[PDB]
Design a binder for this molecule. Sequence first.
Ligand code: ACO
Ligand code: ACO
Ligand code: F5U
Ligand code: F5U
Lengths: 146, 149
Amino acid sequence: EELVLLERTLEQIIFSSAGDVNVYDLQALCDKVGWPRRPLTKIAASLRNSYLVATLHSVTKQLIGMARATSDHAFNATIWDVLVDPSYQGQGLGKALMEKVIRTLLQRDISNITLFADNKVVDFYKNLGFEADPQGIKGMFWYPRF
Amino acid sequence: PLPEELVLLERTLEQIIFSSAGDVNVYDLQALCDKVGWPRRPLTKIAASLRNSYLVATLHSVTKQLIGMARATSDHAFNATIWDVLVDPSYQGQGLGKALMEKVIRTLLQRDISNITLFADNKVVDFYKNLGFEADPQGIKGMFWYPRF
Ligand SMILES: CC(=O)SCCNC(=O)CCNC(=O)[C@H](O)C(C)(C)COP(=O)(O)OP(=O)(O)OC[C@H]1O[C@@H](n2cnc3c(N)ncnc32)[C@H](O)[C@@H]1OP(=O)(O)O
Ligand SMILES: CC(=O)SCCNC(=O)CCNC(=O)[C@H](O)C(C)(C)COP(=O)(O)OP(=O)(O)OC[C@H]1O[C@@H](n2cnc3c(N)ncnc32)[C@H](O)[C@@H]1OP(=O)(O)O
Ligand SMILES: COc1ccc2[nH]cc(CCN)c2c1
Ligand SMILES: COc1ccc2[nH]cc(CCN)c2c1
């Protein structure tokens, strides 16, 4: 559940599966990457209803990474909202976070791990093993507004 | 407002009721899955997936026979994903799949989930395009981790 990813010095990055994510901290994190504000009670509703909530913390605690997944607790998991503090990207942390996400889902016996990737991020997930439109399957949205 | 359960159609020589009540018997479901050719899954895990599905929607043939089902997970606020849309082959081609999906979308809209998603086999993509679903908007790709299919 908890786990020290790395340690540096001039700081240790901790990965957790607890979901101890305070919605104010996550609102800050989201703002840094330019995601639009959303009602904290709705954010909190979506975290409370996420089968998996994974976090990166930089204890010197500061939330610097998150991923989450909805699942039907049996067959299928979908990964929404993975993000790493901009001051921390390029350090291999997005990779680490995802890698424990996939492992934790595989341990809970979810064999169908899916996501929806934006154009500029598809190649980061292809590296980790994800494969777009396998055998022609297509991901579809009802009247999107992106 | 769309009620929890309602009657879609009336024919004789049988009415067809939709419901989002979610009370589907895992046995009946297992048999419907057999008909469409699906391999059988462990009942306790099917039971777990229905239990953990935000929306379970049924089509029954009163005269109760399960003839249609769709389900969706969700995070209760933002996103929803529709899995296992299926209709008994004897009742396909009647507009029942179309009817079932429209109610699913409406229910998810009423609960104010605005991001409604699914993953479509190649053969069924046009079916969902008819209903307003758009594939790969803005380059977004649906991805799977090491798919075995
Ligand atoms: C969630 C969705 O549905 S879409 C994804 C949402 N994510 C976002 O775009 C929000 C902001 N993004 C981020 O937080 C980060 O850019 C992330 C999560 C995409 C990646 O974080 P980073 O820390 O930059 O990635 P990390 O440092 O772990 O790099 C991992 C590997 O992927 C590579 N990589 C990083 N970014 C990208 C990219 N945009 N495209 C391709 N490869 C990339 C890195 O080079 C590295 O490769 P290597 O291990 O082979 O050297
Ligand atoms: C579940 C997923 O996420 S992927 C979908 C997986 N589903 C399956 O493979 C299970 C087996 N297949 C089925 O259950 C059925 O084919 C369904 C549910 C897809 C369709 O059910 P049906 O009752 O046959 O559909 P319905 O009668 O409502 O057909 C509606 C319309 O869509 C059209 N349509 C039906 N099947 C298809 C198809 N495969 N591709 C494109 N259009 C189709 C029909 O011709 C009909 O035309 P209309 O525009 O005149 O109405
Ligand atoms: C509503 O959540 C989703 C789902 C899929 C998505 N693809 C791209 C984005 C933009 C943010 N990278 C996004 C958001
Ligand atoms: C072949 O394994 C998988 C994986 C996910 C699936 N969803 C629905 C089905 C029935 C066939 N479409 C299915 C099968």
